[PDB]
Design a protein around this ligand. Structure first.
Ligand SMILES: [Zn+2]
Lengths: 92, 233, 11, 665
DNA sequence: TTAGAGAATTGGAGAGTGTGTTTTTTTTTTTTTTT
DNA sequence: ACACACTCTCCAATTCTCTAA
């Protein structure tokens, strides 16, 4: 056989390398200021997510990363279990 | 106020001011990056003067222009025969006499593409000598392969010239004949110098490969060398 | 036959 | 066989010479044509070759033969023009039946050859083979017919009509009425022929104007000039206006609909109203060109392309990347964009209409067609007199036809009706917006109940069977009906018509429509947006409202709105105002903030608001920045109150009962 | 309204095949024989 | 025999459709 293809998958997201890093650091990473423009602060939010997206899965363009994440986010039940777990933690 | 674009700079002033004592060495060791940093600094300072002092001059005009630094008086002159492979990509100073100059050569800087079927057009940046042609036409409804094509006479070009510099007799070894080295010069400094002129120059000492044949990517082990001038005196 | 017009041709 | 084919071709050529020829005794250099004998049999046998052979075998080979031997250009036009000029001179003074017979039988062949072309999966392989070439030949026909003596053959055709206008309807035999249908059927074909559409077999993934044809020959502008000089517009205007008085409506009114469709098709109404001028706007456009040039310059390095050094960028966790180029040394934004741009992959992409010539439905209509000053004023005069004279009577007759015949319809007639309605209603609204001399009563037949029911029924039936082209066209028409209603309420029965227009069933349909638009072409989504704007505004000025607005607000509509908005580089200034009106409605008024916290919107505002995209001084930037400020303010508040939304921003919202309610609020 | 089971369309991995390659002045400085 | 240009083929990745809970 030819070599099988490599893909983004929910296992990567649920790994310690994956989504928990964002929730462990996002409160410290991003910082808005009224003292800078709407364009300035809007440009600031996407830095951390772009670098994180590259570190997670360097395959594809950034838009493709988001639009790929949409499918597995809607479909996979284990990922949805993790997400309801997050919002239950806030309900706690 | 005179509407001019180039600034001279004798490097010894970097040693006088305390904050730039180390920048002098970094200039000699890493010219390509440092000179670009200096250029973008000068342009920003020129904008800052008009906006801070709130003058009448057109901001768009200053934004349109390119500004360049031209360092000189870098240090001791170096003999033409004594340049060694450990001097590659460092700044150099030479003295000599001009033999001849070739006519101006057009050098491409920006490419222009046009779609054959839908007439969509794109301008593309040239870096490292390679044209980054698109894979498919980028119009959304005309996403087709092999669909763009180059239009030669709507590209943008720049001037290049080659000058032949000869060793002055003061340095020649005993019982030998003088040698020569080739200088590549661009834009402002193209047509400055004539046969028989005596000059001193300043530029990066470069080296590049050369192909074995025009058909294939096979390179030779020996490398060509030349000088890339940034100032003439 | 798989005939097809260039519907997207508008320049 | 090939020899049988060439035998028929040679038979057609010998018939193309038995027809007659000019006179060599004349000493007149050259004279006109001169007439043969057996010519009745020649024309009749040629008609038989079309009908009895080619149609029965479905070939178009016979048309290729007559095109080879150039019968139209060489014989038929001089025969008709000689008849016309002879009878014209006789009228100036103020067996002859046989001359008139030859005139009739020449015109019928002229209608037959220029008949427009249709291709399906049921057409023969012969016709599919011959489609591309007969298109070229019909283009030659259009040019030649409009050219001869500045188009004088068109005067013969209306004289044939005038013979049947002459005496009372009470006398007029069916064969008599067929002439009056035929003369308009001619003009429909002369307008309809236009440059070809390229078509190939999809076996492998890898212009048609002949050498004697050019655009200015074929443009609509030429047709306006040719029609005006040869006295056509008076004929159409007098025929349509007196249609009510006992011209048998059944024979005339559908072809007379097709004409009005066939040269309203490619006009924007703003081009007909102005709102050294050309040079002035050209200079302004050159300023815009300079701005684009400035944009390219701001990303251009000073020193040459081989001077460049190298750059290294270190992330958190001390990992390093590499990028080249001199501008990357200073601009981190450009470095970050350039880093991702090198990567190869793009996800491949999904794609709605076929079987109809080019129109508003499947082309970008931000591209005018261009008029001489005389042509502009003449065309304006024609359609203005048409509206002031003929519009209501024509629409009443054609609409009370179709209610009795809706089941039998074909897609052409539906799309024709729906794009005749829209054009004339919209044009009258704009003209009365401009000036007080015009009035809205000229187009008032559209509002009466039967036509409203019919447009509704077309939209209904088209949507149910998933026929999307008729759905698009019905969308456009229903938009114009709602706009006209909002005009008349700004001045009795109109409120009754509104209440019947907004029964709950129709609210279900009109709410359903934007959701499916996400998949389709750009024009479909734009139609959905404009219809939605009008629909919601009318129900705003009804004072029910809270029920209706909550019906609209949900994920798939927002998906369509963002998918449409990201192609802003192709769109108008006005559509973005409409989109941000809707976003204001969702975000501020309804306070359904949770919908828009999704990441692909945050990218779009960066792209659209940057120095890249929308102009620094266009009116759009006011709206965009004023929106983005409030958006990020509320987002700051939400994120600090509940840090879980950092992971929330990537994904759709979560529909679980117990956590979802607190998630949304 | 979600989701999962089955069918159809497309991409490009990668394997294969054929191909091309080495290789009469005219002007100007210098030595030599000839009248 | 050693880089190239071009052709051919198979296989699995992807989206679309139907069914039932
Ligand atoms: Zn294209």
């Amino acid at each position: 056989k030819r070599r099988p293809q490599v893909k983004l998958t929910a296992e990567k997201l649920l790994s310690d390398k994956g989504l928990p890093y964002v929730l462990k650091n996002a409160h410290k990473r991003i910082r808005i200021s009224s003292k800078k423009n709407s364009y300035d602060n809007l440009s600031n939010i996407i830095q951390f997510y772009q670098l994180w997206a590259h570190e997670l899965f360097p395959k594809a363009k950034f838009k493709d990363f988001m639009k790929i994440c949409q499918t597995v986010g809607k479909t996979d039940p284990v990922l949805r279990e993790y997400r309801v777990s997050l919002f239950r933690d806030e309900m706690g | 106020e005179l509407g001019t674009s180039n600034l001279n700079l004798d490097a010894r002033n970097l040693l006088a001011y305390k904050q730039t004592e180390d920048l002098y060495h970094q200039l000699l060791n890493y010219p390509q990056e440092v000179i670009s940093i200096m250029d973008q600094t000068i342009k920003d300072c020129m904008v800052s003067l008009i906006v801070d002092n709130n003058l009448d001059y057109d901001l768009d005009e200053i934004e349109t222009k390119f500004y360049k630094v031209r360092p000189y008086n870098v240090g001791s002159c170096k003999g033409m025969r004594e340049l060694n492979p450990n001097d590659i990509d460092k700044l150099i100073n030479l003295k000599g006499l001009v033999l001849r100059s070739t006519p101006v050569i057009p050098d491409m800087k920006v490419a222009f593409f046009k779609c054959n079927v839908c007439d969509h057009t794109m301008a593309v940046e040239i870096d490292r000598g390679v044209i980054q042609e698109p894979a498919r036409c980028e119009r959304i409804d005309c996403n087709e392969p092999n669909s763009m094509s180059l239009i030669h006479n709507r590209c943008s070009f720049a001037d290049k010239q080659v000058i032949k510099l000869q060793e002055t007799p003061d340095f020649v070894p005993d019982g030998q004949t003088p040698h020569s080295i080739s200088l590549c010069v661009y834009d402002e400094l193209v047509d400055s110098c004539r046969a028989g002129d005596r000059i001193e120059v300043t530029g990066t000492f470069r080296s590049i490969p050369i192909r074995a044949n025009s058909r294939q990517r096979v390179l030779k082990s020996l490398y060509k060398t030349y000088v890339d001038v940034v100032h003439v005196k | 036959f798989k005939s097809r017009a260039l519907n997207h041709v508008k320049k | 066989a090939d020899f049988s084919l060439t035998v028929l071709r040679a038979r057609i050529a010998l018939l193309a010479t038995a027809i007659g020829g000019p006179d060599y005794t004349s000493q007149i250099d050259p004279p006109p044509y001169k007439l043969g004998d057996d010519c009745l049999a020649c024309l009749k046998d040629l008609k038989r070759w079309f009908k009895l052979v080619d149609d029965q075998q479905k070939r178009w080979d016979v048309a290729m033969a007559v095109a080879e031997y150039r019968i139209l250009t060489d014989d038929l036009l001089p025969i008709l023009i000689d008849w016309e000029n002879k009878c014209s001179l006789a009228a100036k003074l103020a067996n002859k039946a046989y001359y008139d017979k030859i005139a009739l039988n020449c015109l019928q062949l002229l209608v037959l050859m220029t008949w427009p072309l249709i291709v399906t999966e049921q057409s023969s392989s012969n016709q599919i083979t011959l489609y591309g070439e007969l298109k070229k030949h019909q283009l030659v026909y259009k040019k030649t017919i409009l050219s001869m003596e500045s188009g004088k053959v068109l005067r013969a055709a209306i004289r044939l009509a005038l013979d049947v206008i002459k005496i009372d309807r009470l006398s007029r035999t069916p064969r008599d009425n067929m002439v009056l249908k035929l003369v308009l059927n001619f003009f429909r074909n002369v307008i309809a022929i236009e440059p070809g559409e390229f078509t190939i077999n999809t076996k492998k993934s890898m212009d048609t104007l002949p050498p004697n044809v050019s655009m200015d020959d074929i443009s609509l502008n030429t047709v306006i000039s040719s029609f005006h000089k040869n006295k056509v517009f008076g004929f159409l205007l007098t025929l349509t206006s007196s249609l009510s008085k006992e011209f048998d409506q059944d024979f005339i009114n559908i072809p007379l609909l097709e004409i009005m469709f066939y040269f309203t098709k490619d006009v924007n109404q703003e081009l007909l109203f102005p709102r050294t001028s050309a040079g002035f706007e050209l200079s302004k456009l050159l300023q815009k060109e300079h701005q684009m040039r400035k944009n390219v310059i701001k990303h251009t390095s000073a020193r040459h392309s081989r001077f460049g050094g190298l750059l290294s960028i270190q992330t958190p966790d001390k990992t390093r990347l590499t990028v080249s180029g001199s501008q990357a040394l200073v601009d981190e934004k450009i470095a970050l964009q350039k880093l991702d741009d090198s990567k190869k992959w793009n996800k491949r992409i999904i794609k709605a209409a076929e079987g109809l010539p080019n129109s508003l439905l499947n082309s970008q209509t931000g591209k005018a067609i261009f008029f001489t000053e005389s042509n502009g004023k003449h065309f304006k005069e024609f359609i203005n007199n048409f509206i002031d004279s003929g519009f209501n009577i024509l629409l009443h007759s054609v609409t009370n036809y179709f209610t009795t015949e809706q089941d039998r319809m074909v897609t052409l007639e539906q799309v024709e009706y729906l794009l005749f309605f829209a054009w004339f209603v919209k044009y009258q609204l704009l003209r009365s917006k401009i000036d007080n001399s015009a009035d809205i009563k000229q187009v008032s037949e559209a509002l009466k109940e039967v036509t409203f029911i019919l447009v509704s029924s077309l939209l209904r039936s088209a949507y149910d069977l998933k026929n999307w082209t008729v759905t698009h066209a019905g969308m456009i028409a229903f938009n114009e009906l709602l706009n006209l209603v909002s005009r008349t309420k700004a001045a009795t029965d109109i409120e009754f018509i509104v209440s019947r227009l907004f029964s709950d069933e129709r609210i279900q349909l009109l709410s359903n429509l934007p959701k499916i638009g996400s998949k389709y072409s750009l024009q479909f989504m734009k139609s959905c947006i404009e219809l939605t704007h009008s629909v919601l505004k009318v129900l705003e000025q009804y004072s029910n409202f809270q029920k209706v607005q909550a019906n609209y607000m949900t994920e798939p509509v927002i998906e369509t709105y963002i998918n449409f908005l990201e192609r802003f580089r192709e769109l108008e200034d006005d559509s973005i105002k409409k989109v941000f009106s809707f976003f204001h409605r969702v975000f501020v008024q309804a306070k359904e903030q949770a919908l828009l916290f999704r990441f692909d919107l945050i990218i779009l505002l960066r792209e659209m608001l940057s120095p890249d995209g929308l102009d620094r001084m266009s009116r759009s930037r006011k709206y965009v920045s004023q929106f983005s400020d409030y958006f990020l303010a509320r987002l700051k508040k939400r994120l600090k109150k509940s840090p879980a939304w950092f992971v929330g921003l990537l994904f759709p919202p979560l529909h679980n009962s117990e956590v979802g309610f607190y998630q949304r609020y």
